């Protein structure tokens, strides 16, 4: 029975190796997320110098949103007027990039709603997530408490809105 014992030694050695791979993949995918965070810093002041230069282009956020293959059709005419006051859109991964992010929507003088935003924040760490969204202050949008819309705003439009605008 020289290889009854030596067959367990082999199966636990194998357990050692899957033990240490889980460590090396954690360093690796940790160094990966140090790089994500580095670049969010680098991107912020450029995203900020974009938002500001966009303020001197008249219909940019509305024109962009609409022009999009996906996002365009959902906006109905009532939304679209309010959307003519849609001076900015603001995506930003929160500082600990892995946790979450928020999709603010800026606005200006318009009677229907006095709210100065319509954010839709997120936090996840991946089996369980969550969504806390601005309550709509209709003065004197079927979104706000899987998700496809938030993805296409974070990853596609926010990324490059000018592609759609043309």
């Amino acid at each position: 029975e020289q290889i009854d014992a030596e067959l367990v030694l082999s199966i636990e050695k194998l357990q050692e190796i899957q033990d240490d791979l889980e460590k090396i993949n954690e360093k690796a995918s940790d160094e990966v997320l140090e790089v994500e965070q580095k670049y969010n810093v680098i991107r912020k002041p450029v995203y900020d110098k974009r938002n500001e230069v966009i303020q001197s282009i008249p219909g940019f956020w509305m024109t962009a949103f609409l022009s999009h293959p996906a996002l365009g059709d959902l906006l109905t005419e009532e939304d679209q007027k309010i959307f003519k006051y849609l001076n900015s859109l603001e995506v930003e991964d929160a500082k600990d990039v892995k946790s979450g992010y928020s999709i603010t929507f800026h606005f200006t003088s318009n009677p229907f709603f006095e709210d100065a935003k319509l954010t839709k924040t997120f936090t996840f760490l991946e089996g369980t997530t969550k969504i806390t969204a601005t309550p709509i202050k209709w003065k004197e949008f079927t979104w706000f408490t899987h998700d496809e819309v938030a993805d296409i705003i974070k990853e596609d439009l926010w990324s490059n809105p000018l592609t759609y605008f043309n």
Partner: protein
Amino acid sequence: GLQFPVGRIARFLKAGKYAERVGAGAPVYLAAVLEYLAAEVLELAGNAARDNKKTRIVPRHIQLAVRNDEELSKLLGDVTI
């Protein structure tokens, strides 16, 4: 000729986030210590296995081997089975 794994223990200190740096004195030094602390709790637990008249150590053998020696009950504790 150490039995215990210097490299694997070196990694455990780094990944453990105990310190980001380690001079290969430590994993060697630490490995030698965990080897001696097993080579006590075995030279005793294995004696226990010949008291209760066997050649297969089990929880009852380790519990008795610990609690009887003073130092190892201070170190380890009750050993509830």
